[PDB]
Structure 1
Amino acid sequence: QEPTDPKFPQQWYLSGVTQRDLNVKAAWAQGYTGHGIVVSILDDGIEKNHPDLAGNYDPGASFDVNDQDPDPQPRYTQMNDNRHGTRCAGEVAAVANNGVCGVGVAYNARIGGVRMLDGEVTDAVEARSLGLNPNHIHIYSASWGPEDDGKTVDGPARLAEEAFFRGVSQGRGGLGSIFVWASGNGGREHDSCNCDGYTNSIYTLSISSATQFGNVPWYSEACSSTLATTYSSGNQNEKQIVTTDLRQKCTESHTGTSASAPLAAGIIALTLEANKNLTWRDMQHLVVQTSKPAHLNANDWATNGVGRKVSHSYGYGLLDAGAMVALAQNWTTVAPQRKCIIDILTEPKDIGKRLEVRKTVTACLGEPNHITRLEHAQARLTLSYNRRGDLAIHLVSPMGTRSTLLAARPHDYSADGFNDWAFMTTHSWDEDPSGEWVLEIENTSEANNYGTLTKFTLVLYGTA
């Protein structure tokens, strides 16, 4: 039976009947609601006594890292600053059929929150949050990252990177923590989200946004590391996200890519109920295979080497919950992850106005890390340049798939270049990476800019 909650009709991205939705009712009708799954929101806290959250609240999925106590209750202020985690929690697991607000995507999942943004957010704070109770929490949702000013290059420092590797390796009984991540809100600053090391990570399942009418929202950042898309806000004729709000209220104006990641986390919760044995990599495969480009407008939809349409705004397209839970049920676990390291340069290369580096690779032929079926690929680049934001960088796979690694960033005046920065693309997923790869570095300005590429490491992940 369809939810009876008073605002469920306003949750157009779930309740729609016009095919502009996330196809969640189809998963609910297959019997999947999130029962037995545990999700945690890493944000500014969670109103655990909210009438639409209390029934699913899980103290075992929660902690207060900012004040160092178990209780993630938000700090109440006159401007309601610390409401975001409560909004995101309801998107995932707001209680259903209780006469309050609407429902969560996974309305029978258990939901917690980590209060970790309301304070000085250090590497240690991030690590302690990403690493919370990793054999109880299945899925983490994080909407935060480095400043979206269009001039920052930053990512997880050592403790947080260690937390990512521990989570995916030993978390969830060795199946791997699922870290769902928002790709950013820096669109009007012309931000380019591979410059955000959290969303650019292979260990995060990164999500962008589409407006109700199927367009790229003003706030969206394009990048090759994004995997897929959920609906969120757009212009003032387009509806927004409807969910739980601070002070036991219900909001119809939750917005941004930061509202897209929680919806993805709920869909992933339904999928994990359908197959509890999925690994962190399995889950990314399911997203790649089932997501839907149709009716998302972008001028960069390109067909990759295995016939999938991919966009830097949308990844593989809109998440499809019904298809995710269906494919999950008989999914065969992927083979162990291989990693093929190819150091490319024999000498430093002057960049000048334009540099092209071509290299034919065997992808570790004859070795235990031989890869014929790519998952993520990275170009780890070390270079100097006098104005970083004038650079644009592309990587072309042997199958001809052109991934933008970096778009021009007008505000990025930095003279510090890139220091072994691991630009990541999802767009060659399932391609055979043997053959010629091409790296393109271009000065997009008319200025006489200058610099040097001193290291190019092609890193291939995948299977055979």
Structure 2
Amino acid sequence: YQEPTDPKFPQQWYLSGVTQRDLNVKAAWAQGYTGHGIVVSILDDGIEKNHPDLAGNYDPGASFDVNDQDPDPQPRYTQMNDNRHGTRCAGEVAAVANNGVCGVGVAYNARIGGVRMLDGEVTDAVEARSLGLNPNHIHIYSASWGPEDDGKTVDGPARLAEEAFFRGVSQGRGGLGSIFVWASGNGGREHDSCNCDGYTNSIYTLSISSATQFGNVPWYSEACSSTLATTYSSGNQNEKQIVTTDLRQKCTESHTGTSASAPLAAGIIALTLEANKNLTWRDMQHLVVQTSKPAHLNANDWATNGVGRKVSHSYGYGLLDAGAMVALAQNWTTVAPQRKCIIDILTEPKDIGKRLEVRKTVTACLGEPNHITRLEHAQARLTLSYNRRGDLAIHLVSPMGTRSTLLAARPHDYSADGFNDWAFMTTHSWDEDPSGEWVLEIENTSEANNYGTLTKFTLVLYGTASGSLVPR
């Protein structure tokens, strides 16, 4: 195997490293996997389809302009180069290799398109038409953005966009399901908590956070229990950043944020799908859970879950490992059909006050076709009133003792609107048996005499009843 000769490939430290602080992509390339036959689309501000490092892999069938309602996603050029981000992301996935230009994509033989959908008013219809673009041609969608990362917003897909997610995972990709890769957010300095973003908090999105070059949680990171895994991105000014294609046929060394991590993940997922094109959308999440690596990622919240995997709210299961992903994909046995066990928990509304604990022992639909002995995602769907939302912290403890933070305190969130059946999601109990006692904790983290009421708690378990591995 001959590694790429591109002039900036040595600067792509998160691929070309020899120090073990990389995504282990060369190992996948050397196994023969470069993304041939896979189609990725970047949902963003457009794609410079004539970029010298993108044209050779550009796919019009992976592209559309939902902002202007035409097929051509070319960015709008401005003095401030506002609409460059999709071009940066596209190159992370699929910049052409061995052509003397900039660097390479993770999946440098994949086909790459973009949906121009952020350069204009983003409505539910715009979102739905983007998520649902050509779902039997596009394999993988990469989205780096969501609701405002101001640390006070709670929002998620409205009806058309949620329908696009369910149509995508159900009928997309020949019934195997569209793979939606999402950035968990850039709201770290606003103390944002990313389960309040319904796109990354979705079970249908494969959500990705960031680590800095030296293995730390970047300033912009959001912690939450819905995150699955991590890729490298930017950090402080002594740490390197992401090197990729830029608007106006240029090359940047300063692409940054969690919004730069999701495209690298999308590229690794492209290599993995080349290794086994029959993987379902859930298979892909299982592969990420099993192969991702905590080592050398620094956080104070690493915890071992009930099947012996280390998990963090900053990093999920750790750093994506492309060589391991493609290796495990090749002989992967398709997971069983997804079961869903719905447990309405409360017999009466519960005053929150300073602190509320709700304990319930469940059988996880014992005796029914939705009996789950092997969890995937779990949700606590909560309806509650409170006078100052951001003073709340919420935790969910599984029968195996795994504490998931569903909501951390958000100091900027002054809302008095509470949560209206908000489906807080955790990945941290993946592969655990969910039978037994679950505990929901709601706490007022402030000294203020805050008040409100929990009126509904639905525990929603997804998963299967077969196929478990021996704990790690």
User: How far did residue 44 of structure 1 move?
Assistant: 0.1
Q: Deviations over 1:205-224 (max 9, x none)?
A: 00000000000000000000
Q: Deviations over 1:272-310 (max 9, x none)?
A: 000000000000000000000000000000000000000
Distance in 2, Cα, partners of 1:361 & 1:48: 53
Distance apart, 1:61 and its partner CA: 0.2
3-state secondary structure, aligned to 1:394: strand
CA distance in 2, matches of 1:237, 1:231: 15
Please, which runs of 5 or more residues in structure 1 have no aligned partner? none
1:32 has 2:33 as partner? yes
Cα distance per residue 1:223-267 (max 9 Å; x no partner): 000000000000000000000000000000000000000000000
User: Cα distance, 1:409 vs. partner?
Assistant: 0.3
Which secondary structure state, in structure 2, belongs to the residue aligned with residue 364 of structure 1?
A: coil
2-structure distance, mates of 1:437, 1:144: 32
Aligned counterparts of 2:446 and 2:115: Cα–Cα separation in 1: 44
Q: Deviations over 1:135-175 (max 9, x none)?
A: 00000000010000000000000000000000000000000
CA distance in 2, matches of 1:170, 1:447: 49
Offset at 1:321? 0.1
Aligned-residue offset at 1:405: 0.2
Query: How far off is 1:193 after superposition?
Result: 0.2
Residues 166-206 of structure 1: CA deviation (Å, up to 9, x unaligned): 00000000000000000000000000000000000000000
Aligned-pair distance for 1:107? Answer: 0.1
Deviation at 1:393, TM superposition (A): 0.2
Which residue of structure 2 lines up, in the alignment, with residue 438 of structure 1?
Answer: 439
The CA distance in 2 between the partners of 1:99 and 1:55, in whole Å, is: 13
Aligned match of 1:389? 390
Is 2:58 aligned against 1:60? no
Between the aligned partners of 2:219 and 2:200, the Cα distance in structure 1 is 19
Q: Deviations over 1:45-86 (max 9, x none)?
A: 000000000000000000000000000000000000000000
Number of corresponding residues: 464
Q: Distance in 1 between matches of 2:410 and 2:75?
A: 36
Aligned counterparts, 1:110-121, within 5 A:
110-121=111-122
Partner of 1:235: 236
> What secondary structure does 1:266 align onto?
helix
CA distance in 1, matches of 2:29, 2:66: 34
- CA distance in structure 1 between the aligned counterparts of 2:148 and 2:65, rounded to whole angstroms: 23
Deviations 1:29-49 (A, max 9, x none): 000000000000000000000
Q: Distance in 1 between matches of 2:429 and 2:222?
A: 20
Report the Cα offset of residue 372 of structure 1: 0.1
For 2:280 and 2:460, the matched residues in 1 are separated by 21
Deviations along 1:315-364, one digit per CA (max 9) or x if unpaired, are 00000000000000000000000000000000000000000000000000
SS at match of 2:174: helix
SS across alignment from 1:173? helix
1:95-128 Cα offsets, whole Å, 9 max, x none, are 0000000000000000000000000000000000
1:67 partner SS: coil
Q: Equivalences for 1:99-248 in 2 at 5 Å?
A: 99-248=100-249
Query: 1-side partners of 2:117 and 2:66: how far apart?
Result: 5
Task: Measure how far apart 1:6 and its partner are.
Answer: 0.0
Counterpart CA distance in 1 for 2:3 and 2:59 is: 25
Please give the alpha-carbon distance, in whole angstroms, between the structure 1 residues aligned to 2:49 and 2:55.
6
- 2:90 aligns to what SS in structure 1? helix
Q: Give the 3-state SS of the residue equivalent to 2:115 in structure 1.
A: strand
Distance 1:69 1:340 in 2: 42
Distance 1:121 1:233 in 2: 27
CA distance in 2 between counterparts of 1:448 and 1:334 reads 48
| Cα distance in 1 between the residues matched to 2:72 and 2:109 | 22
Shift of 1:312: 0.0
Deviations 1:404-455 (A, max 9, x none): 0000000000000000000000000000000000000000000000000000
Give 4+ residue runs of structure 1 displaced > 4 Å after superposition: none
Provide the C-alpha distance between the structure 1 equivalents of 2:202 and 2:357, rounded to a whole number of angstroms.
25
Q: Per-residue deviation at 1:134? A: 0.1
Gaps of 5+ in 2: 466-472
> Residues 300-449 of structure 1 correspond to what in structure 2 (within 5 A)?
300-449=301-450
> Structure 1 length normalisation: TM-score?
1.00
Tell me how far apart the structure 1 counterparts of residues 266 and 413 of structure 2 sit (CA, whole Å): 32
Identity %: 100
Q: Aligned-residue CA RMSD in angstroms?
A: 0.2
Query: Aligned partners of 2:390 and 2:108: how far apart in 1?
Result: 43
Distance in 1 (alpha carbons) for counterparts of 2:254 and 2:282 = 33
Give SS of 2:172's match.
helix
CA–CA distance in 2 between the matches of 1:364 and 1:177?
28
Q: Distance in 2 between matches of 1:45 and 1:447?
A: 46
Distance 2:383 2:145 in 1: 26
Aligned partners of 1:416 and 1:72: how far apart in 2? 38
**How far apart, CA to CA, are the structure 2 residues paired with 1:20 and 1:90?**
21
Counterparts of 1:70 and 1:195 in 2: how far apart (Å)?
33
Distance 1:68 1:379 in 2: 38
CA distance in 1, matches of 2:63, 2:189: 34
Matches of 2:383 and 2:50, distance apart in 1? 49
